[PDB]
Amino acid sequence: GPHSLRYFVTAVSRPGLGEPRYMEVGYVDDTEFVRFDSDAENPRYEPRARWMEQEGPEYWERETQKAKGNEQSFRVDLRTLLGYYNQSKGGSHTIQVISGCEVGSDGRLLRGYQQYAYDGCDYIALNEDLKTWTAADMAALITKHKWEQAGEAERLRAYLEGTCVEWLRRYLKNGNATLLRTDSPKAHVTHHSRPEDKVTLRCWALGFYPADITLTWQLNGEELIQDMELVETRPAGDGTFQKWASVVVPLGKEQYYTCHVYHQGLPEPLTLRWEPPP
Amino acid sequence: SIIQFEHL
Amino acid sequence: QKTPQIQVYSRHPPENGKPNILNCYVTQFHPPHIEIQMLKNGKKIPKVEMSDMSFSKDWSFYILAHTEFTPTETDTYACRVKHDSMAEPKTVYWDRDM
Numbered sequence: 001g002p003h004s005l006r007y008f009v010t011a012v013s014r015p016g017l018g019e020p021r022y023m024e025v026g027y028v029d030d031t032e033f034v035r036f037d038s039d040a041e042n043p044r045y046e047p048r049a050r051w052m053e054q055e056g057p058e059y060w061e062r063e064t065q066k067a068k069g070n071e072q073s074f075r076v077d078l079r080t081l082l083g084y085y086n087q088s089k090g091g092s093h094t095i096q097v098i099s100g101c102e103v104g105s106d107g108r109l110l111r112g113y114q115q116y117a118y119d120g121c122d123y124i125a126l127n128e129d130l131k132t133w134t135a136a137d138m139a140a141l142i143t144k145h146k147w148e149q150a151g152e153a154e155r156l157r158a159y160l161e162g163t164c165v166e167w168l169r170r171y172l173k174n175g176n177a178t179l180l181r182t183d184s185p186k187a188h189v190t191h192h193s194r195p196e197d198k199v200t201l202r203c204w205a206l207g208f209y210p211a212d213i214t215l216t217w218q219l220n221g222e223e224l225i226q227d228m229e230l231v232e233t234r235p236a237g238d239g240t241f242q243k244w245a246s247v248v249v250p251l252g253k254e255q256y257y258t259c260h261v262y263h264q265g266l267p268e269p270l271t272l273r274w275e276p277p278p
Numbered sequence: 279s280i281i282q283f284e285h286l
Numbered sequence: 287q288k289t290p291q292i293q294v295y296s297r298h299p300p301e302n303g304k305p306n307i308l309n310c311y312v313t314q315f316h317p318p319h320i321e322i323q324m325l326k327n328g329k330k331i332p333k334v335e336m337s338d339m340s341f342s343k344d345w346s347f348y349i350l351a352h353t354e355f356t357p358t359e360t361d362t363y364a365c366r367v368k369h370d371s372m373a374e375p376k377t378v379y380w381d382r383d384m
Contacts, residue, residue: 007280008341010320024280025340035338063279070283077286084286094317096345099281116286117345119287120316123286143286152284159281167279192383204381206299233384234311236297237352245382 002110003029003179005168006100011074013093020078022071027100028171029179030210039184043068051175081118084139094119099124101164106119112160130157183209183240183266189274194248200245201274203259207236214244224257287371290315292378293366300382308355308380310365313348321368322351325377327361331342336371357382 008025019038024045026034026275033049045063047053077095087093095118102111114126122136124143131153135144147153172179185208205213211233217224230245249257254274261270291314297307310324324331337350355363361381363380 009280009283010318010339010341023339026280032340037338066280067281070280072282077283092317092319095282095286096341098343120345145286146286147284150284155284156281164280190383206281231293232291232313234293234295234309235311235350237307237350240296242295278280 002102002104003168003172004100004102005164005171006030006098006113009070009074009097011071011078011095011098012136013078013091015092019076020071021213022067022074024067024070024243028168031179033171033175033264034063036064049175049178051178052171054174059158072216079130081139084142095123096120097105101160101168103165103168103245107165107169109161109165112156114156114160126153126156130160181209182265185213185261185263185270187259187261187270187271187272189259190256191274191276192246197251198248199251199254200248201247201254201257201259202244203261204242204244205239205261205263206242208263208265209240210264211235211241212264213243214260215243216260216262217245218245218258218260219256227251287312288316290367290369290376292365292367292376294363294378294380295384296353296357296380296382297352297377298356302358303356305354305356306351307352308363310351310378311348312365312366312367313342314346315348315369316346317370317373319370320347320349324351324353325366326355328364331355339366343366361383 006027010023011020013020014108022038024036025032033052034045035048036045045060074095078093097115098115100113101109104110116123124140124151125134125136133144133214184213185205187205190202194200203215205215217228224247228245228247233241236242259272290312295309309330310322312322324334325326334351339347339349343379348382357364357378364377366375366377
């Protein structure tokens with residue numbers, strides 16, 4: 001399948017509390033493999049996956065010094081946007097960046113990303129053609145003209161097509177088999193009281209990786225989308241994930257409902273029913 | 279390897 | 287500003303008398319500054335470990351707080367979050383069926 005290398009960047013000013021916090025977090029196929037935090041006692045790039053430790057001391061020193069120069073660039077950027085938006089030097093503000101590439105099975109670039117955000121709202125983004133910019137407001141228009149004059153879109157097309165893909169394949173050689181690891185969900189149904197003649201049937205999916213999963217409740221063969229309750233997928237804390245879905249059913253009609261678990265680790269979708277003890 | 283960012 | 291969404295749940299299926307992990311999963315909040323406490327019978331738990339903060343594709347941040355605990359039949363647990371989006375700290379109570 002396709003692969004991706006993406007970097008999530010955060011720069012937060014905190015006037016009166018110290019220097020801005022800067023973070024660089026890298027993901028291979030949505031999996032964190034490197035992270036830089038300026039608030040550490042020693043600010044250095046650190047591997048977040050054991051398979052990144054084969055990379056030599058020159059790689060870590062090159063990335064660390066690059067992050068530190070990026071941090072200075074963001075410190076300047078936070079001051080610039082105070083002028084763009086006519087904001088005071090006393091407030092805290094956030095700059096966020098998503099940067100990276102999506103690569104297909106043939107090794108060719110599928111999608112390139114360079115997206116910015118200021119205080120949680122879109123600021124500017126590189127368009128899918130990798131030649132034009134989409135600016136979200138008047139302040140972003142200043143950045144757009146500045147970047148158009150300097151050919152910045154030109155500079156990222158070269159990085160996204162060349163540098164990003166080459167690093168992604170280099171990282172993939174060390175961690176390709178690790179990223180494909182899956183853990184299938186273990187599932188069961190629980191039974192809970194409801195007022196009067198109703199009961200709740202809760203279908204659990206536990207200990208699965210990756211996080212993508214689908215849980216459905218069926219009366220006969222009809223999916224009960226409008227009537228069920230479900231929680232957002234959540235981490236167990238040990239690397240796996242959890243999710244549940246529940247429906248309120250009439251008392252005595254529990255055996256009329258079926259739960260279905262769809263996960264990429266399963267040979268075929270799981271089918272479950274409420275099962276009372278002997 | 280993350281890109282070197284350009285000023286806004 | 288975006289209001290945090292909170293889930294309080296155990297890592298393993300809860301069994302009274304068996305050591306476990308209680309999680310407080312806080313998502314969809316902006317700005318990233320946040321304060322998260324875990325309470326036992328209304329009283330702050332002193333050792334609460336925090337995961338590194340990450341952010342999503344809609345730009346909102348998320349983080350996992352957890353603490354070792356041994357559930358009992360009558361002990362009540364909760365997670366309290368202070369964030370600029372809300373006038374008030376928000377408290378979410380652990381429901382062992384959820």
